[PDB]
Design a protein around this nucleic acid. Sequence first.
RNA 1: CGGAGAGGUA
Lengths: 237, 226, 63, 49, 82, 678, 25, 577
Amino acid sequence: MLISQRPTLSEDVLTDNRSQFVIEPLEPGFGYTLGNSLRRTLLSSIPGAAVTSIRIDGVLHEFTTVPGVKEDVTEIILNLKSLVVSSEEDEPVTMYLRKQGPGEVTAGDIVPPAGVTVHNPGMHIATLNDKGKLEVELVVERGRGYVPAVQNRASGAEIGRIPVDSIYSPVLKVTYKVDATRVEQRTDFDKLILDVETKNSISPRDALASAGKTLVELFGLARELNVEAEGIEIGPS
Amino acid sequence: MLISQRPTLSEDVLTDNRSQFVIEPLEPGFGYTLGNSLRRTLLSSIPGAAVTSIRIDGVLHEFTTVPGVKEDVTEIILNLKSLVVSSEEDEPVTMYLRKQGPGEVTAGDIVPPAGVTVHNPGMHIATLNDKGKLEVELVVERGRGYVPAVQNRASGAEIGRIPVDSIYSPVLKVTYKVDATRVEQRTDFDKLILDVETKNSISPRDALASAGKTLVELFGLARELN
Amino acid sequence: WLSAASFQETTRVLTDAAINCRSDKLNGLKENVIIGKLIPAGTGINRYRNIAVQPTEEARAAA
Amino acid sequence: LRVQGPREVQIHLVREVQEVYRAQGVSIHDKHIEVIVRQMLRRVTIIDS
Amino acid sequence: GYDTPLGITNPPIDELLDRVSSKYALVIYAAKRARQINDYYNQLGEGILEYVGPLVEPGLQEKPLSIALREIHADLLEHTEG
Amino acid sequence: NNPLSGLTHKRRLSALGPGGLSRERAGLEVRDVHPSHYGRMCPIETPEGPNIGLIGSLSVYARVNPFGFIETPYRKVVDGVVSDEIVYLTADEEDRHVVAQANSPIDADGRFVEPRVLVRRKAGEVEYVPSSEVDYMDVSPRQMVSVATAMIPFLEHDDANRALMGANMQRQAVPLVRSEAPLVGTGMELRAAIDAGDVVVAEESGVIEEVSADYITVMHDNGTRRTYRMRKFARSNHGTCANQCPIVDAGDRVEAGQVIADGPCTDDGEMALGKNLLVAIMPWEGHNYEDAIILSNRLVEEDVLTSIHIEEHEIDARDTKLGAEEITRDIPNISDEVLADLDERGIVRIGAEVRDGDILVGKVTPKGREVRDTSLKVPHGESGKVIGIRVFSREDEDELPAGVNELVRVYVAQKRKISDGDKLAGRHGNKGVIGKILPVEDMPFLADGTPVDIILNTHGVPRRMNIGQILETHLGWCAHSGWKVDAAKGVPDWAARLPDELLEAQPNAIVSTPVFDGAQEAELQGLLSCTLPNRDGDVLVDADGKAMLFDGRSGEPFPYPVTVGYMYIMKLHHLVDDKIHARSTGPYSMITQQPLGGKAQFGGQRFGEMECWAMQAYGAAYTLQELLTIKSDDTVGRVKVYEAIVKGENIPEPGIPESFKVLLKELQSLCLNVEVLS
Amino acid sequence: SSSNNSVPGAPNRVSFAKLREPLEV
Amino acid sequence: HQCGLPKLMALELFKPFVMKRLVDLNHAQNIKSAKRMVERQRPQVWDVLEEVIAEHPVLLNRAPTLHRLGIQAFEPMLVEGKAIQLHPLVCEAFNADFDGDQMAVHLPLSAEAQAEARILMLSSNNILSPASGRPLAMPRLDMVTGLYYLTTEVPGDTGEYQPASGDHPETGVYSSPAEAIMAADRGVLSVRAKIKVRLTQLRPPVEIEAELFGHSGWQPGDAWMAETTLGRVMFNELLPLGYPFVNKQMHKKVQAAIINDLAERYPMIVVAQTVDKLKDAGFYWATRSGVTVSMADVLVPPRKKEILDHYEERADKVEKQFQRGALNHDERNEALVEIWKEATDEVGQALREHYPDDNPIITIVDSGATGNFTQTRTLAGMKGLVTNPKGEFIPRPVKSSFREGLTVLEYFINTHGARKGLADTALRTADSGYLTRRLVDVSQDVIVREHDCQTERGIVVELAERAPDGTLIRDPYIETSAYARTLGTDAVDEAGNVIVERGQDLGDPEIDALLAAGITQVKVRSVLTCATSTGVCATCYGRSMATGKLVDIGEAVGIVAAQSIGEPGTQLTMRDI
RNA sequence: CGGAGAGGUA
Ligand SMILES: O=C(N[C@H](Cc1ccccc1)C(=O)Nc1ccccc1N1CCS(=O)(=O)CC1)c1ccccc1F
Ligand SMILES: [Mg+2]
Ligand SMILES: [Zn+2]
């Protein structure tokens, strides 16, 4: 059959890393059908890269403090966990961070291989206020969604390894809402108001496009069962 | 930690009008959302056919009785509300029912034209004792969802016409279950199993294909950004 | 006598008022409600209901 | 009122009403009861014309 | 420090109450200005007599009271009590 | 409204009348429950308003003796052995004896099992007495309740207030298009339906000869015949529908006293006032907030809660002093399209659809041609199908009143589906309006995909002390699903006293739990613990009576199991279609030029004294002034305001209302010299 | 175990009652 | 500030405006054609109606109108149906539930009437109770249950914080609430599990801010480590930006205190928006709180029989002593009313101790949403003592609970009591209205007329009388006697300087400073000593409880006083003095 | 739509 709404997508920019999209003319009941699937695809489908594990020289047994560094170990973990990185090589890579003497350790003080890049060189990591030294090596991988720390059952390779939770997805937060969008003798048409917040490695529009692509691919599986079955057509733009 | 296996859909045929579809592997947490999106589309937006109105010979409205039949015409309307018909036309078509003398009037006594077909002969409509004759004219039409009766004032019809509520839903019952695989190496994935049961008007494969077409059409707009 | 008669004991109040030839100054909420006048409270007070409004000189010039 | 004066009867009435209402767990500010009690004490009885 | 007001709740009442001594003064202020605007609109079909039209860009179908409140909020008027 | 309402109306005792009490002056001690009411007047069923305690209902077993005193049966006991010899005692006679309860253990004969028995004494006093001092005994544990109160399952688990509400509200249910009896009843429904008289009963034995929707013919054994006529789509005193349906075949043999046809709220001869619905007891997104209810859309698609209502309209043609006002189709200055439905005589045709403002009977009166139009119209908010016309003409020697020639009457019927604002209710004093009606696609559903028909909030159950609805829900799920007690090695100890034939049941089994002698808690637990699987072979409700649901909007399973089951819901005659009213202008009273009051008069809403107090407390002077002057009785202000609004102008100032002038004229009529000084 | 046996064509509704009724309504 | 208005009722209320607009837009040539078009409800009237009703306030009223907030103004919006849609947060003000109630709608016409309805009477402007100042538009019932569930910490939950064990670092610390929400979505974390979070958009408490940032301030965007649950972060994200972080379980009293603080420190628009957000969150989380009712949830105390036997022994001993010559009838009755009172108390205590802390009934009662524990004891314990037609307790108790089912002789007396209560309620509601009318009539002409009479009289309020051993103990009834009052004389302590100046609102900070300084009694201004000839003055009356500021010069305070006194007259029971 | 009565809802 033929629909009589032809939904239209609109965007409102609230920041360089935050937008608010709207799909106004949706048939009654298709706000919730689309919103949850779109949110899930945004938050768990787009691939990315993150730090998977680290090893700090000078701390092997007790993870309490690093000599010569003001901040304890957990603060270093949280700071490295907030690093925005992009990787192309499938296999894990290994970075290195080392600054000597007094100063401020920043995300820009690391030299990644040609296959990796850092999108926030100004991020603060640690401060050396005791004429000390810092030496930590990072492991970066590719993945999708949020993956908690994977316990190191095989510790033979190294005993200083500290696995960390990986936020692979470049989308940080998403929410949606549904309202009413008609007055022509009908007050039951749905609205959809997504509020996408993303990292510095991708804009919300690209994330939305990728989510739409993935959902189309997923539902092509169902569509292939009977290609001539009757559905609903929105029509040409 | 990047799985490069795409999902695949497979079917298991439990019976004529019930089947199970299995979709795996999926991202962890995505089974329920996909299953419920499919279920909502199946339960709400599948086109079908239904009877829009009828016209019995000697009656003027639905608050009356036919001489010789044991059911008041309202009960006949309620009984007819259970018909399942498949229509291949795109415009209204008229079916005819005729019975005389002692016996039972059932859905197998209807005479449908080319295209339309009745799928549940033996339904039961009314009973005629000795002197009851039943001659009801039925109009079949295509659509989707639930449409209440269209009054004669809006349609510009005569007094003998009796509008009837239409239910153009070929699907009967839908449910899903998700099998999760949570191993300690974080190589997790989901498995979706969807059960579709139709009321003999179509097959669950056709309903799933219709839902897939609808969802692809809807989600093609969000991908227009690129 | 109007407020008293509208409260209780209409007959006694009316007979006493008639004998005494009482005059009613319509200064009260109930009396103004009865005669359909603006109550002397809230926005019905003189300082409020007699406000004068006009555009400022700069706004008038900006026209 | 005849023995102690107007202020004492005012406080007496306010306290009595407030305690009757407090026993049930209802909170009303004293200014409303004070308005009513003020309205109750507005006249004087004449003795010598 | 508040989300954008919507509907009858715009402009904020707290902002409006800074312009006047009381809420009753605001009521009479706005009512009289709305009456002036309505008289202007009615007489415009015949001719200007004594009044000034909206001092702010009115909406497509905005009503006189909303325009009066907007004019009061964006300081454009002056009032004197009795 | 239904058979139960009339049956309880006939069995009513009222204390107020020509020689009785006053509805206002009556004190608090005449409205109380007295110890002498036990077995003669029900303590539960009374009104809730000013008539609380002044109108009561006769008990089930009570009767009145020749002098007019209510009696009640008691079972005589001799030497501590309960015999079977019923004697009727008045209250004064009963006060001289001590009577035990029906729930007194017995040992297969009259002998009392226990050595001491709890008995009732003179002035509402109970004492333990040796079994040899007992004089009488109740005939049942339901001797004190009435007919309507005996139809509440698990009554003893409900507080008095909710039981009173439920007994009152069972008499407000409207007949539905199709009826079905409860899964869990009490047994006081077959006799309640038969004695009410809305069903058709076979007077003599015979074999059904011909059966149709209009009549039944019975061939008696002695060769005689009798034909019963069914009243179809009749109208009750309250506008409901009274339709009777035969429930016998063309060859069946009947017995004397057997039900031969159904009635409004009867299903196979049993009272059926509602429908069985699958309920959930969770709070849902605030739509069932503060006694509101959430419904599925299936109940609208499948006409589960649909009703038929019939209106009656009549007009008469008088002689008039002007002369001879007539009913005809020739009405001046009316388009020929507006007269399409009228027939040659001048009345609408049967089977025609009528809407608000439509013509029902064209009439013209000679106001002096000068003949005006005084036809019969369809009132505001009324529509339906014309199903019948009755016309009485004096020319046909009809017994019409003096001065009228025609008395045509018109009946229009309409089917009403359930909608937001309608009032539902269970049998345990639980009530609420329908807050929302959700699509089937977004209702909570069970693991097999079954949506729930209704959702009730959790916060109303424990506070109101009516926990019998939860027990009814549990037993209703047990009955709908079926069960089988696994007595492979002796019956379980919790089923020792459970009657045989109750150790096994099939799906959709009808059971009864009498009012004070019914199912226990241990038996309910046992039945819940052993129920049959569903079609696939899975048990959806566990031993606690709670199921695991899915969220229909997001598809996620709810974190904790919810309580699901079946309870009996009734549709009350408090539909929102009869309560919506609005007005802008209309009729005014003549003595004082104020708007009329009444929905049927197209009246206005009264703005009383307390609303004036509220407005004065707000400080809103202009609003109050306009309400009192230009909206009520300012004769010129009304027209000036209407003109100003229909033009672009602003509202004018008010003037003196007419009621003040009427007051001044009355005061002058009292010989008082009232003057307005200036 | 059923509820009523006096009315000829009555539905078979099974009861949980444990007490016998000497007298009919 | 919104209400749903049926389309069919809106078409009739706004008939002249719709006719005018139909004529203006050329849909009709004259007014008669437009009138007929409206009468026939032709398809062309709904589009104009939508725009006609825009920003036109509407008054809603529910009878009985016991106090001022029984009438309020809203912004209509057309809905499909024939029932009016009412906001859940105004039911307490209206006293309206949804079991069949009906309301009336009124339309203001003139410019002044619309201005009054839009400023004075708007629903979002009336949040606080004029009688006491407590908030009336705050979460209740389902919302309270949802917020209480959300802001609760359950020890040993999923994804809980774990200290370092010597082989792995600390577990359960997140770099932002977004990561915590992702973990909760994945099922690895619980909304009610204690964690450590880094926060940058939430203001730290006073202690943390003082000991962590100092002088400069929080300056949004500064990171600090919090030790709370995720539900508490979610709750605090619903409050204003500058509000300090609240780390507590949200009993109804905590929410009321939060709302009072917001009302007294923020503009009312912020308060209205905050209550709307709290409504949304509470309704969302009440659905997922898992509160239901089943007979498995109605736990019975495990040792009721033992307690009942223990106290039945005492009753038997007393009865046998009476049978012997030792005490008369009245002594026996008093002794038996005792014993059974203690048995009821002991059964209640055992029931309370048996129940788990997360039981739905216990959760609903303890959350402050609705109900009390007497009903819980009656439902699951035993009803207890009943009363005779004279009101005195019967010496025989009702030992059954409604979970077990009262017998036929324990139901008869229960029904007696219930009907007696209903009749008494009817008589009390009839008796209270007469008192309210008399109170309104006596004090209907007490109106604020000046700003200050400059009188030197006043009254003395105890304000936390001192202790014998030497200490200041706050007077329990201080908020209804000392708050919202103006000082009549300067407050001085031990020859020191003035602590509070003359003419001070005397709020919480002032009272706390007075208590700290060591001064008990203070003289205040009261209407009892106002010197204005007609009416009262603003300073003598003091703060307006509804507004929180000095009362205006046109306010009618007598009617407010009468409505405040008379409204809670049905709650106040009618119970030789 | 003037009055009287009866019943019901919150
Ligand atoms: O008292 C009980 N039940 C009696 C049972 C009874 C009903 C009718 C006739 C005779 C007896 C009662 O209902 N009385 C009665 C009923 C209505 C009004 C007054 C009375 N009373 C109270 C007991 S009173 O002070 O002695 C004298 C007056 C009872 C039984 C079991 C457990 C606890 C109980 F409190
Ligand atoms: Mg109510
Ligand atoms: Zn003063």
